[PDB]
Amino acid sequence: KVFGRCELAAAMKRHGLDNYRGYSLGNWVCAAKFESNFNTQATNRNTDGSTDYGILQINSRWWCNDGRTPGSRNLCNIPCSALLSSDITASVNCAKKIVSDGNGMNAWVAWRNRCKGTDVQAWIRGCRL
Numbered sequence: 001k002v003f004g005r006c007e008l009a010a011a012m013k014r015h016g017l018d019n020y021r022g023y024s025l026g027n028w029v030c031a032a033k034f035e036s037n038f039n040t041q042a043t044n045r046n047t048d049g050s051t052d053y054g055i056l057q058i059n060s061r062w063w064c065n066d067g068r069t070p071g072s073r074n075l076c077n078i079p080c081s082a083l084l085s086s087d088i089t090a091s092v093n094c095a096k097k098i099v100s101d102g103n104g105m106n107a108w109v110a111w112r113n114r115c116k117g118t119d120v121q122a123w124i125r126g127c128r129l
Contacts, residue, residue, distance in 0.1 A: 001086035003038040003055070005029065006127035008088075013129055015092040021099050025129070026120035027111065028095075032056060033123070034110040040091075041084050054083035054091045056108065063094055 003011070009029050012018065018025040035057035036042035044052045050061035050069045060069040064080035076094035083091050098107050105111045 001040045003032075003040070005033075005038065005123065006129075008032055008038055008055070009124045009127050009129060011088050012092065015089065017092060017095070020096060021104055023099065023105055024120065026123035027105060027115060028056075029123035030115035030118070030120045031105065031108050031111040034114045035108065040086055040088065043084070051080065053080045055088060056091050056095050057110075058083050058091065058094050058098065063098060 009025055012028050013025055017028045032038055032055050035052075036055045038055065040055050042054060042057065044057060046052060046059065046061070048061065050059050050072060051066055052059050053064060058064060058076070058080075060066040060080050061072045063074070063076045064078050064083060065074035066080040076090070076097055078090050078094065083094065099105055101107060105116070
């Protein structure tokens with residue numbers, strides 16, 4: 001599913017991401033934009049052989065099982081394919097764990113490089129939330 005911007009913001013808000021570990025909603029929407037272009041089915045292979053899955057491009061090295069990332073963990077206790085569903089529940093719950101791991105949103109390199117320090121509130125401008 002490709003979410004609309006305000007559609008995704010609402011879903012993220014419902015699932016409790018708005019100010020989760022202090023990160024306003026627009027941080028999460030901005031991250032989603034640059035990680036997946038709001039596409040739940042997005043996948044990307046990393047150089048180390050791990051793969052990123054879903055709207056927030058959650059990596060199989062640590063967070064989900066895909067059966068093909070040697071020596072990896074599955075800390076969200078989910079198959080990586082759950083991260084591609086049109087229902088973002090698994091992506092959001094897993095993101096909660098990731099952002100809690102000590103580096104906050106810096107865990108998402110695109111957030112650090114493209115969102116951090118910008119006017120992220122723009123991402124939710126005009127949305128009925």
